[PDB]
Design a protein around this ligand. Structure first.
Ligand SMILES: [Cl-]
Ligand SMILES: [Cl-]
Ligand SMILES: [Cl-]
Ligand SMILES: [Mn+2]
Ligand SMILES: [Mn+2]
Ligand SMILES: [Mn+2]
Ligand SMILES: [Mn+2]
Ligand SMILES: [Mn+2]
Ligand SMILES: [Mn+2]
Ligand SMILES: [Mn+2]
Ligand SMILES: [Mn+2]
Ligand SMILES: [Mn+2]
Ligand SMILES: [Mn+2]
Ligand SMILES: [Mn+2]
Ligand SMILES: [Mn+2]
Lengths: 95, 84, 106, 99, 92, 104, 97, 78
DNA sequence: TCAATATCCACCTGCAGATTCTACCAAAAGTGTATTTGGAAACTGCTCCATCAAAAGGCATGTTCAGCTGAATTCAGCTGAACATGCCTTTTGATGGAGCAGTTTCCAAATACACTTTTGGTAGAATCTGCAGGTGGATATTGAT
DNA sequence: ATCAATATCCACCTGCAGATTCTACCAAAAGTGTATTTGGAAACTGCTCCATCAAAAGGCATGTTCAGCTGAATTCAGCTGAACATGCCTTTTGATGGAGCAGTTTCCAAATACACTTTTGGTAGAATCTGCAGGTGGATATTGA
């Protein structure tokens, strides 16, 4: 009867402490942060999916995700989003 | 056997509306606004409650979850952060 | 030792989970190894951008715990994010104070 | 004196007031009935996760607060400082809520 | 080769207006239409099921799905037709 | 002996099915989802085509064109509402001129 | 020498263009504009003839619609002439900016 | 170049819009709006293009574009 | 109300750009067959929804009263509409001539599956701690005179 | 320009919700082979694109007048806002009873997963048509006198 429920809290936090070590998020606020996290994971995952479909392509690779991110995020966030994501990838693929 | 619900649309008082209007940054308010607002509200509500109750019904439940409302607000295009 | 893809990727966000949410999301048959890495990366980034901004709002309020109000203030004061979350509504975030000029006294 | 504030001096005071806050401006209980009253007239014998009624109220006010802004704009664009029904209508009419 | 609903659109046309014909360009719009709606129903259909932690989109989904997409009265027939078209299929 | 005929439909039930599978909507697809969906598509299709056919007759043409589909859509509360965010290319707008603009 | 009151040919043009459905912008100029705008996004691109048509249909349809809302606004301002301030508000409420 | 879009043409659109009298400043204003409309649609299309590693903008690209702008268009790309 | 001027509206007429036809080869779309497994039934476990039960004020409500705002005129400029006048960029119709979208082969490089082996993330239980929610005194802001 | 009548502010001030650490387990996430494919290379075509005429041809660009139309004053009820007085009816903790939402197993009707056949639906040529758009003429509508 553990009836476990996942989340992003743990991480929203880690990152919070990363930019503003001093401050801390409340709760209703953390709640909002998840909504945000999920809302974009889908906006992106979707677009990614839709994109991949139009090309008769079978799988969603980082490429997809990127173009997605590019279609979704506006101007700046888009640029910074990419570099950040590209970078993080090659590091994962650096063995 | 609880009581009959009726005309509750008046719960949305005149004061309650002008407060909303202020946050909306409105200075002067015509006497008609109030009833017009009440109507606009009912319509907004109806539509979201409808769709919501549908997600409920479809899930074979008798209780409306926050999620029901959240999904309802989202397909309507009023995505809400804070509950789902 | 076992390696968290996140660590191998240098991220705080769960890569292992992002990948899983993708598979179970019926977005497509298959999923590349980089997809999660890259997705989580963007998520975590954006998350940081909001928080950095949000947190400040908090400080200017003399408050040390970020609250919805702060999230709103942060989001609505930044074109980028406000554009992004234009159709999004933050519960308990109130409105950005703004009064039409025409409304002020002579 | 007695001391009366010129009509509108307070109204303004009230905008700076509520735009500074974040709580709900419609009363809880009265609102909850409208939900139950409306809900009821669709599917009978329904129940309500408390937080669901909150999602709704958060949603409604946020809607009305926003609608009102556009309205205030229409009034002003009408060389009026008073919002009237015709303002709410053109706003929605343009918003695409209904034609 | 590129599939299309042109055929079925026509077959349906010659049923309500056996007399009326249909412009090529006009036929294009009719396709756009079918795809768009197919898409819409199918979406909410999956979306919905997904909400219920279930792994299969059945007619149940499609129907509710139609009820969330189509206008109160336009939805009825859409619904009746659906149930009908099924029982008939599922019977014989 | 095709489900489409078995279900008594003019639309491609079999195809709708394959499309539901390829489309990536769920893992498994009920056997009635196609037949059903298929029906709904066909039905809306007729509705349009019918009004569009009419649109054309009263116009004295025997062949349905885009405008026709447009005039048929925008004149129906239901449809207009449905495709309120869609533009039928080459369908122009409905003839309507605000009162305030007419001469005295 | 026959002349019509101001606004007569205007109402006529309305009755006339609301009836017709052909595109109202010259294709060449448009196509040129498209390719130009596009060139800032990726160099040496080719356009499907039909891709440009989509763009023009979409574009014109858009403006035609935006003008409608604009009029309502202008009329709301108790005018009969549409000014910039009108297109602006219309857009603004529309949530385009 | 945006000037390619002329007064008469702009005049006609408004006309189909049901507009009677037209202030002179409008034209310039209209060009802007018009230009942004395209900037946004294309910017997106060209992206669907570039993703598909093509060098040609297909009507379908434009469609999938106008579709996420919330400008769904019936008639092209099937 | 005459009176032209032009603008529509009509009932043909027929040449020409597309609609039915026509005549056929492959992917789908059916058919058994052989597993497979989703999730529709019980069956509880126990969470959280619907209901009182009283008091408290915090706020509606209804009423005065009159500031000043929305409506109603009038009235000039000033600005667009309506028109010939004259070029001049579009439009069209046809070619060639490369580009490409699109196909096949081909085939490592990736991705799916399974089999168990860890260990990180999610409850609850304790262990803190930012922050209402209250109180004064500057400090400001209004508004009468 | 002064100054009395109220709002704001802006610290200062502890006792709590609520947060923020503690443990403690499972449900993922990681690992290690195997087996099944993407979908990215290279040539290789055959459609659209593009770049070039050029042919007049309808549109635009352009100044003239002027009719309105818009933006400016100037009143002038009354309809909103500001303030009170008077109570109602939300709030607000505090319990429960017990309608359901969730877990947990079974087990079967309904879905894959496979070849293995038929049937149908996209081409790439034929065989007619529905209208466009050009006539005439009849009014009709728009405008001076
Ligand atoms: Cl990848
Ligand atoms: Cl009104
Ligand atoms: Cl089914
Ligand atoms: Mn920092
Ligand atoms: Mn199972
Ligand atoms: Mn008076
Ligand atoms: Mn005034
Ligand atoms: Mn080549
Ligand atoms: Mn651990
Ligand atoms: Mn305080
Ligand atoms: Mn004059
Ligand atoms: Mn009372
Ligand atoms: Mn029970
Ligand atoms: Mn056949
Ligand atoms: Mn004709």
């Amino acid at each position: 009867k553990r009836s476990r429920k996942e989340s992003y809290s743990i991480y929203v936090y880690k990152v919070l402490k990363q930019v503003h070590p001093d401050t801390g998020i409340s709760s209703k606020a953390m709640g909002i942060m998840n909504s945000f996290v999920n809302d974009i994971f889908e906006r992106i995952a979707g677009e990614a999916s839709r994109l991949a479909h139009y090309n008769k392509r079978s799988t969603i690779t980082s490429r997809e995700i990127q173009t997605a991110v590019r279609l979704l995020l506006p101007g700046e966030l888009a640029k910074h989003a990419v570099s950040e994501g590209t970078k993080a990838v090659t590091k994962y693929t650096s063995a | 056997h609880r009581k009959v619900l009726r005309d509750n649309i008046q719960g949305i008082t005149k004061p309650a509306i002008r407060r909303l209007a202020r946050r909306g940054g409105v200075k002067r308010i015509s006497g008609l606004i109030y009833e017009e607002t009440r109507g606009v509200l009912k319509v907004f509500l109806e539509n979201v409650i409808r769709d919501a109750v549908t997600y409920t019904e479809h899930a074979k439940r008798k209780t409306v979850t926050a999620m029901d409302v959240v999904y309802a607000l989202k397909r309507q295009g009023r995505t809400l952060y804070g509950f789902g | 030792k076992a390696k968290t893809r996140s660590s191998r990727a240098g991220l705080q966000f769960p890569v292992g989970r992002v990948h899983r949410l993708l598979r179970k999301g019926n977005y497509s048959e298959r999923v590349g190894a980089g997809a999660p890495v890259y997705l989580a990366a963007v998520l975590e980034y954006l998350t940081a951008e909001i928080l950095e901004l949000a947190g400040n709002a908090a400080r200017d309020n003399k408050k040390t715990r970020i609250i919805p109000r702060h999230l709103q203030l942060a989001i609505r004061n930044d074109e980028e994010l406000n554009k992004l979350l234009g159709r999004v509504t933050i519960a308990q975030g109130g409105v950005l104070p703004n009064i039409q000029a025409v409304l002020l006294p002579k | 004196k007695p001391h009366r504030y010129r009509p509108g001096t307070v109204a303004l005071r009230e905008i700076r007031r509520y735009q500074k806050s974040t709580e709900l401006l419609i009363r809880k209980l009265p609102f909850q009935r409208l939900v139950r009253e409306i809900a009821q007239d669709f599917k009978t014998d329904l129940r309500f996760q408390s937080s669901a009624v909150m999602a709704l109220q958060e949603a409604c006010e946020a809607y009305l607060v926003g609608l009102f802004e556009d309205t205030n704009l229409c009034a002003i664009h009408a060389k009026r400082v008073t919002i009237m029904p015709q303002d709410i209508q053109l706003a929605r009419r343009i918003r695409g809520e209904r034609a």
